[PDB]
Structure formats: structure tokens, C-alpha cells
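Design review, sub-item: ligand-bound model
Attendees: FS, YL, KQ
YL presented the inputs for the 017 complex:
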Amino acid sequence: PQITLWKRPLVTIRICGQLKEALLDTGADDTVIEEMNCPGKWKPKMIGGIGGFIKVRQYDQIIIEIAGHKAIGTVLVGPTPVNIIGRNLLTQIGATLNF
Amino acid sequence: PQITLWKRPLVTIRICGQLKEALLDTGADDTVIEEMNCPGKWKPKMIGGIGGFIKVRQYDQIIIEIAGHKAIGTVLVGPTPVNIIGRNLLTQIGATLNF
Ligand SMILES: CC(C)CN(C[C@@H](O)[C@H](Cc1ccccc1)NC(=O)O[C@H]1CO[C@H]2OCC[C@H]21)S(=O)(=O)c1ccc(N)cc1
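KQ shared the predicted structure:
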């Protein structure tokens, strides 16, 4: 599909058996998902943005379906205000920026 | 161009006569540029991102060239980690996400 940018580019995702809305985010290196009590091994990470850093849990090889497109990779879980699909999974679903 | 997302979507911008590097950021509502001298009046605003809120100077109707494409609109100037071109200007240069 083609997504214009008049509004936030939000899509439905499925992760850890849950449906969520998430932002397709070309400005995020990594994918960050709002706090959820998920299983699996993880490593502590800190990620920085506008305002400073938040502490997150890094899970590897997490399967996510993004707008019907399957992806598998690193998902960071923590107190983000919005669910963010970053470049690590955008590349896997064939997403480009065009102008 | 069509821009794939294996690398950060960094482009050269010209703002207030100065060349800068900026990130094309579909997850940003607003364009936020690092502290710099900008001519004219501005108003104090705050904006929030992943780590909390910062104070910025809002400059309106700023002419900015983005990867060779002209925009004129709002630029927030403040202590952002990265120069970000947000949707308020991505829409002006005809940028869409595609997959
Ligand atoms: C600042 C960017 C270089 C990086 N970020 C992605 C960015 O797209 C966030 C994504 C975002 C969006 C909303 C809330 C938090 C983070 N947007 C953002 O800070 O935009 C601000 C400027 O315009 C406003 O519109 C939305 C918030 C404001 S980030 O959220 O901090 C970020 C940093 C690291 C990773 N792995 C993932 C995301």
C-alpha cells in the first residue's frame, strides 16, 4: 500500500499473540513496543530520543506481523508512549520512503 | 527518490542559509532542528518524545530545502539528539511510505 503522511502512519500489528496499533517510523533504528508481560530471555538496553533515555528489555528473534506482512527480529519492550516499528523490521516488510 | 531503510534516511538540508544533515522521520509530527541561530520572531513551545519533554523555539514559515525539494513551514529549534524532518514538511515534499 501507499501511506500518505497527513496523519500518523499507524498500522495494526500482531505481536506475542496481541493486536496493537503501531507507528511506521523511518526515524527509529529499532522497534519499540509498549510495556507488556511477555515471556522469553532478554538483555537490558537504554534507548535515547527527544527528552532523554528510557530503559527497555531487548528480545531477539521476535515474530511480528505488520499490516499483514510477516517479520522477525529484535523488539525492545519498555515504557514507550507509542508502539514504534523501526527500520530493523520496516526493511523486512519492503517499506520505502518515496518523493 | 525511492529510499530504502537499511541505512538511516539522512539527507542534506539548507535552512537559514546553512547546510545541515537531517533524518527523514515518518514518526515525527513536527520538524525539530538542533540549536542554531534563526532570524525573526519565535515562540516558546514544548514537545515530547520517547524520553520526555524539551523546550523549543517555534519558528514559522521557514524556507527549507530538503534533498533538493523546497518546503516552507514550522521548524522547532532545540536540544534534539538529531535533526529530524517530520511530517509537517515531509507532506510538503510529497513523501509517502510504500510497501
Ligand atoms: C528522535 C528520533 C531520532 C528517534 N525516535 C523516533 C522518532 O520517530 C519519535 C517517535 C515517537 C513518537 C511519539 C512519541 C515518542 C516517540 N518521534 C519523535 O521524537 O517526534 C517528536 C517530534 O515530533 C513529535 O511527533 C511525535 C513526537 C514528537 S525515538 O522514538 O526516540 C527512538 C529512538 C530509538 C529507537 N530505537 C526507536 C525510537
